[model samples]
Target chain A: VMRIGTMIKQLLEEVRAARNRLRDIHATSIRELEDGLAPELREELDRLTLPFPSDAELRIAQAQLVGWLEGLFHGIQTALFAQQMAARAQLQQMR
Target chain B: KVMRIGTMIKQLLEEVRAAPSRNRLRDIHATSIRELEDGLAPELREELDRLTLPVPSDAELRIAQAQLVGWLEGLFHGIQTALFAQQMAARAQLQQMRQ
Candidate 1:
């Protein structure tokens, strides 16, 4: 339905907004995660990068959304690994 | 819609299959993260419901339903990652605090 198409559009917009807010806020810090985990955990995030249709128009938006998800989840996994390493370094210094 | 249900499943899978489910103790922002995820589901469900149509044919219905499930599957992955990104982001900030 057209309603579902709107849903995809709104979600795509929401996602674009969220990324901007973070990038604007973190600027320098945020980029550190781009390069990148919890072995298996990282794999789960990575596994989602894989590849849909519209009602054909619906498929287009749906496809875009999935591509973004792959990038976003990959970022999350990267960030988590960065934190994990960071926390460990700090802990090591204390000891 | 069913995407809401799928989002919930994504949360569970991320915990069990990804992220550090057992390691939330030092998450520091777990409370806030939990609240946000739970909150988004309601807002999402509301929007989806509002988008609901008053009323598809059987063939169209079946085809539509099949297509919908796949789309939902893809979107929820994105949504859950969006949520996970928040948790890792907070953890990143805390690394700043802890160090």
Candidate 2:
């Protein structure tokens, strides 16, 4: 459980960092395109904006990690609930 | 943790709903202009003045700046709408777990 919790935290942090990097790129790209002087220079700035690698990549990774976690948690929940139900039945039989 | 998912969903919704309009794009463009022309542009100009040499034409530079601004505006809009949708979907799944 502790290991799983730590992994979840790490995955969440990765997503946050990716979002921030993407946001920063968005800001810089806007700055470059709006006030760029020459057409060539403008094109260069636009290209810089196009080649961003943060958001999409991070999102894909996040989805996979989340799916893994979902499966793990669902199994744990089912097993725990079944155990509880068995214990309740045993107590009823004792009565 | 579950509450965090709800918060994330709300944030994603806000960004998607608000960031893609023409008005928002224009506003971002304006902010970029101020940053370049009043901030970085003047500083670079000062550097050129120390050289006592011909400087790049402002006209050419302005075009490049415009392109940068446009690119940035589009990127912001894209991230806000598309990325937000992606995030919202993810969060929605998490929210379902609580029920």
Please compute the TM-score of chain B alone for each predicted structure, in the order given.
0.38, 0.32
- Candidate 1 lDDT over residue span A1-95, tens digit each: 01223333444354333023322322222222232223434534453321222244443333334333332332233333444555787899996
**Mind giving the per-residue lDDT tens digits that candidate 2 earns over A19-90?**
455445344433432332335444435443323244444444333333223222322222333345557878
In candidate 2, stretches whose alpha carbon ends up further than 4 angstroms from where it belongs are A1-15, A19-58, B1-99
Best by TM-score: 1
Residues B5-45, model 2: lDDT tens digits: 22433443344334323334344334422332322334435
Which DockQ-derived CAPRI band holds candidate 2? incorrect
- Compute the lDDT for candidate 1: 0.36
lDDT (Cα atoms) of all candidates against the true structure = 0.36, 0.36
Where does candidate 1 chain A have its weakest 10-residue lDDT segment? A22-31
Each model's DockQ score: 0.09, 0.03
- Tell me the number of clashing residue pairs for each predicted model: 2, 29
Q: Which ten contiguous residues of candidate 1 chain B have the minimum total lDDT?
A: B20-29
Between which residue pairs do clashes occur in model 1?
A: A53-A59, A54-A59
